[PDB]
Amino acid sequence: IEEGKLVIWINGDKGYNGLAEVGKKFEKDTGIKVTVEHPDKLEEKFPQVAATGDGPDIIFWAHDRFGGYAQSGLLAEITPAAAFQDKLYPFTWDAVRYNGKLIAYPIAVEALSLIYNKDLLPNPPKTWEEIPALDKELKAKGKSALMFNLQEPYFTWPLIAADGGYAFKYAAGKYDIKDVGVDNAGAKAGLTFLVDLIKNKHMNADTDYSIAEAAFNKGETAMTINGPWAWSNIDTSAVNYGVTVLPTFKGQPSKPFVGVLSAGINAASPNKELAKEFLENYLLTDEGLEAVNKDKPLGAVALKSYEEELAKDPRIAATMENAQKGEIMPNIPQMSAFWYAVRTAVINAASGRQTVDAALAAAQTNAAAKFNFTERDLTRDVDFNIKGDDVIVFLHIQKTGGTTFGRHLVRNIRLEQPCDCKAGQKKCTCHRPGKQESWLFSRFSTGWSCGLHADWTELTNCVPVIMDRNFYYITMLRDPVSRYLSEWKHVQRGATWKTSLHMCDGRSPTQDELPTCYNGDDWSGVTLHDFMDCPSNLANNRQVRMLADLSLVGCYNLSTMNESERNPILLASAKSNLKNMAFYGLTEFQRKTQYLFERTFHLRFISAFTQINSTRAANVELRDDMRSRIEQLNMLDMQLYEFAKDLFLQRYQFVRQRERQEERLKRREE
Numbered sequence: 001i002e003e004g005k006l007v008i009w010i011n012g013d014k015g016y017n018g019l020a021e022v023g024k025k026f027e028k029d030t031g032i033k034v035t036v037e038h039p040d041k042l043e044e045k046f047p048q049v050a051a052t053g054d055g056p057d058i059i060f061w062a063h064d065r066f067g068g069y070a071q072s073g074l075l076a077e078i079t080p081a082a083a084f085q086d087k088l089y090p091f092t093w094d095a096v097r098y099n100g101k102l103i104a105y106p107i108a109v110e111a112l113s114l115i116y117n118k119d120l121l122p123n124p125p126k127t128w129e130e131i132p133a134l135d136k137e138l139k140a141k142g143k144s145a146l147m148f149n150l151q152e153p154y155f156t157w158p159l160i161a162a163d164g165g166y167a168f169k170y171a172a173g174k175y176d177i178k179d180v181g182v183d184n185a186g187a188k189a190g191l192t193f194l195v196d197l198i199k200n201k202h203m204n205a206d207t208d209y210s211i212a213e214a215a216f217n218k219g220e221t222a223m224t225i226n227g228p229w230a231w232s233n234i235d236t237s238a239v240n241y242g243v244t245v246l247p248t249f250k251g252q253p254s255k256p257f258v259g260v261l262s263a264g265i266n267a268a269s270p271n272k273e274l275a276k277e278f279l280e281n282y283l284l285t286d287e288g289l290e291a292v293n294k295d296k297p298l299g300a301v302a303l304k305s306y307e308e309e310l311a312k313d314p315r316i317a318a319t320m321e322n323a324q325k326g327e328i329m330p331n332i333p334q335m336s337a338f339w340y341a342v343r344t345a346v347i348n349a350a351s352g353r354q355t356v357d358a359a360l361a362a363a364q365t366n367a368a369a370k371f372n373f374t375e376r377d378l379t380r381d382v383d384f385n386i387k388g389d390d391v392i393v394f395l396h397i398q399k400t401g402g403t404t405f406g407r408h409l410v411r412n413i414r415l416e417q418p419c420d421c422k423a424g425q426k427k428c429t430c431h432r433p434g435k436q437e438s439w440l441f442s443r444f445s446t447g448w449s450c451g452l453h454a455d456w457t458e459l460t461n462c463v464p465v466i467m468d469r470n471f472y473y474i475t476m477l478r479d480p481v482s483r484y485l486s487e488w489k490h491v492q493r494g495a496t497w498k499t500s501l502h503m504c505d506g507r508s509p510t511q512d513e514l515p516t517c518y519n520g521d522d523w524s525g526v527t528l529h530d531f532m533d534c535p536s537n538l539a540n541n542r543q544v545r546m547l548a549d550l551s552l553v554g555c556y557n558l559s560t561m562n563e564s565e566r567n568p569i570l571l572a573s574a575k576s577n578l579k580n581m582a583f584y585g586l587t588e589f590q591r592k593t594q595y596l597f598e599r600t601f602h603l604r605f606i607s608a609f610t611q612i613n614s615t616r617a618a619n620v621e622l623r624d625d626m627r628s629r630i631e632q633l634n635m636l637d638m639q640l641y642e643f644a645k646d647l648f649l650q651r652y653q654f655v656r657q658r659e660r661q662e663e664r665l666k667r668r669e670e
């Protein structure tokens with residue numbers, strides 16, 4: 001981001017040419033250039049890049065995305081004088097308040113309306129229920145009743161919400177993120193109605209924004225559902241159209257989710273005062289908003305003065321009627337998870353590939369961020385025969401507390417013949433009774449015989465050969481921000497693990513495949529910024545990479561597939577390999593780790609594990625924006641760890657409960 005310039009991101013359906021005109025007036029008056037851009041998926045890109053030092057100075061989107069950005073420390077708190085605040089409606093400032101603080105400037109209120117072609121349909125239907133009859137009439141005339149975007153849940157939500165669907169329950173002054181309303185009876189009735197429209201061929205599951213718009217603007221369909229921004233192209237096509245209240249469902253109004261177009265200032269912007277000037281003194285004026293509105297209409301604008309001027313527009317009147325009947329969107333971080341969940345459910349139900357009930361049940365789980373596991377997933381019972389052919393393999397991922405855990409395995413297990421650890425010696429002899437055979441494959445027993453910090457791909461391909469059986473793989477995991485910081489501090493004091501083989505498909509990577517991040521013998525002294533800056537840093541997503549089958553993505557050769565393909569493959573593979581291990585622990589839960597290891601393998605430790613809170617990672621003072629960048633660099637690991645933590649804690653609860661029941665049944669004999 002350059003100082004002395006402004007870069008603005010706004011969505012491609014908004015009046016970006018008009019906004020650019022406002023930017024040119026600002027430049028005329030100040031010599032400060034303003035660049036407007038409309039990148040694809042800007043709302044996903046922003047948290048990915050703002051966290052570094054790219055990204056725009058100002059980001060426009062509906063307010064629902066901004067709580068998540070604010071929680072990650074990506075937005076500047078905005079500081080409008082009371083005089084300026086009174087220029088906009090309080091309704092709209094509420095939309096942009098997060099945890100007591102204002103995090104953007106409200107621009108305009110948007111709600112979906114029913115848009116109809118007066119030359120085909122001079123009185124639009126008041127109910128969804130009458131649409132099938134109407135369509136049958138229109139099809140006899142070579143036309144259809146209704147087409148609108150079925151791919152984005154924003155457009156189908158009004159119907160799903162009408163009879164009772166909700167996102168998050170509002171209770172006791174906040175949104176309850178555990179009380180999700182996507183699979184209740186009302187939600188199902190709404191979605192069932194839409195699925196039925198499609199089954200009876202009144203609508204097509206494939207219809208998206210473009211297809212619906214093209215059909216309406218060409219007079220092929222009598223109605224569409226869309227926002228104020230859409231009116232411009234309709235006027236361009238010279239359709240004679242009206243904008244009205246959405247139809248009712250089961251006698252109740254359609255309830256669109258209401259958005260407030262909002263302008264946030266990037267926390268990493270060196271231009272915060274200039275951004276403030278532009279927004280307050282150029283855009284949020286009658287003239288600024290008029291310039292944007294003339295390009296693509298904004299809806300009901302937040303600035304009282306200009307909102308009064310346009311209030312008489314019946315299109316805006318209908319927009320206000322639908323907005324009053326709907327609900328303002330929450331701005332909480334969990335909104336994007338809600339939307340992603342509903343997006344998928346609606347597509348799969350609409351296609352007929354999944355029933356409404358199953359699809360919404362899946363959305364419910366996802367929106368509430370829950371994990372369902374089978375009994376088999378929770379039950380890990382290993383008749384561990386040290387006398388037999390069983391071998392425990394400890395896959396040690398760097399900085400997960402593996403030195404501690406590995407020392408526990410060789411020093412701390414009560415065995416008839418425990419490991420023989422001679423004083424002042426690194427390794428131990430962990431042999432079966434009476435034999436010269438090892439029961440533990442690990443750094444402190446066999447050594448790094450399949451390579452330094454051999455990962456899942458290496459171990460599974462090397463261990464069986466180098467020991468000739470039942471192999472019981474185990475590992476430890478750590479929250480990724482802490483694990484990443486720990487690795488940065490260890491590298492900063494000389495760690496490189498440069499002798500690791502990184503073997504996959506029978507060879508090590510080439511330098512082109514895996515470039516080194518440092519010149520010279522090591523990366524000692526590196527700052528966190530420079531650590532984060534190397535694209536090929538093996539610290540990034542280390543736990544996923546080391547638990548996945550790397551052959552599935554072409555090993556270390558990043559040209560063999562795109563990131564959009566490679567990433568889901570890695571995550572799924574790591575989840576599967578982890579889940580299917582005999583056991584794993586979490587660094588943050590030392591005692592639960594001990595207990596589950598003991599109950600999995602039917603072993604006991606001599607001395608209790610202990611929790612060390614005062615780690616080197618814990619001592620790093622971490623800005624929220626920086627934490628967020630570390631999360632983004634480790635996003636696969638963040639997902640793996642969320643999964644792993646939940647499974648681990650569900651395993652703990654399951655095993656403890658069972659043990660408590662057993663004790664009790666025993667007492668209920670005596």
Ligand SMILES: O=C(O)[C@H]1O[C@@H](Oc2ccc([N+](=O)[O-])cc2)[C@H](O)[C@@H](O)[C@@H]1O[C@H]1O[C@H](CO)[C@@H](O[C@@H]2O[C@@H](C(=O)O)[C@@H](O[C@H]3O[C@H](CO)[C@@H](O[C@@H]4O[C@H](C(=O)O)[C@@H](O[C@H]5O[C@H](CO)[C@@H](O)[C@H](O)[C@H]5NS(=O)(=O)O)[C@H](O)[C@H]4O)[C@H](O)[C@H]3NS(=O)(=O)O)[C@H](O)[C@H]2OS(=O)(=O)O)[C@H](O)[C@H]1NS(=O)(=O)O
Nearest residue numbers: 398399425426427443447448452453494495496497498499
């Ligand atoms: O045996 C020979 O061939 C011998 O021959 C001699 O010549 C003759 C001998 C005899 C006769 N005769 O007539 O009788 C004639 C001639 C010749 O002079 C020798 O050069 C030659 O020796 C060669 O072979 C021997 C046997 O293989 C080698 O000795 C082995 O290896 C040594 C070594 O590699 O240094 C040494 O191993 C011990 O020390 C290592 C280094 O510390 C240990 O490995 C390290 O483990 C670290 C760890 O786990 O902590 C790891 O650290 C990294 O990860 C951790 C955890 O994440 C981080 O904390 C660290 O920060 C991180 N550091 S990093 O970022 O820098 O990576 C390290 O990476 C890893 O290197 C090793 O575990 C330890 N083994 S031990 O405990 O068992 O002792 C030993 O002497 C020996 O090991 S072993 O074979 O017994 O297992 C010798 O090196 C080799 N010399 S060479 O010149 O040919 O290469």
Ligand SMILES: OC[C@H]1O[C@H](O[C@H]2[C@H](O)[C@@H](O)[C@@H](O[C@H]3[C@H](O)[C@@H](O)[C@@H](O[C@H]4[C@H](O)[C@@H](O)[C@@H](O)O[C@@H]4CO)O[C@@H]3CO)O[C@@H]2CO)[C@H](O)[C@@H](O)[C@@H]1O
Nearest residue numbers: 013041043044062064065152153154155259336339340343
């Ligand atoms: O990978 C699947 C898709 O993911 C991406 O879309 C996501 C967004 O990132 C989420 O934020 C959300 O989108 C919401 C949006 O936040 C909300 O404001 C509303 O968007 C309206 C907008 O208010 C209005 O101004 C106008 O622009 O129409 C928008 C709807 O098209 O509703 C959205 C949900 O429909 O969820 C979506 C996933 O549905 C990514 O951008 C996609 O390209 C990708 O396919």
Ligand SMILES: Nc1ncnc2c1ncn2[C@@H]1O[C@H](COP(=O)(O)O)[C@@H](OP(=O)(O)O)[C@H]1O
Nearest residue numbers: 399400401402403404486610611612615616617
């Ligand atoms: N019992 C324990 N409780 C909490 N953290 C522990 C621990 N034993 C080790 N760790 C942490 O695990 C990291 C070392 O992992 P490894 O042995 O795999 O290199 C260190 O993190 P820090 O570097 O942040 O201090 C260390 O503090």
Ligand SMILES: [Cl-]
Nearest residue numbers: 446447448449
């Ligand atoms: Cl070794």
Ligand SMILES: [Cl-]
Nearest residue numbers: 589590591592
């Ligand atoms: Cl614990």
Ligand SMILES: [Cl-]
Nearest residue numbers: 598599602603
């Ligand atoms: Cl037990």
Ligand code: NA
Nearest residue numbers: 425426427447
């Ligand atoms: Na040795």
Ligand code: NA
Nearest residue numbers: 399403490495
């Ligand atoms: Na260490």
Ligand code: NA
Nearest residue numbers: 518519520522
């Ligand atoms: Na160096």
Ligand code: NA
Nearest residue numbers: 618619620621
């Ligand atoms: Na800290």
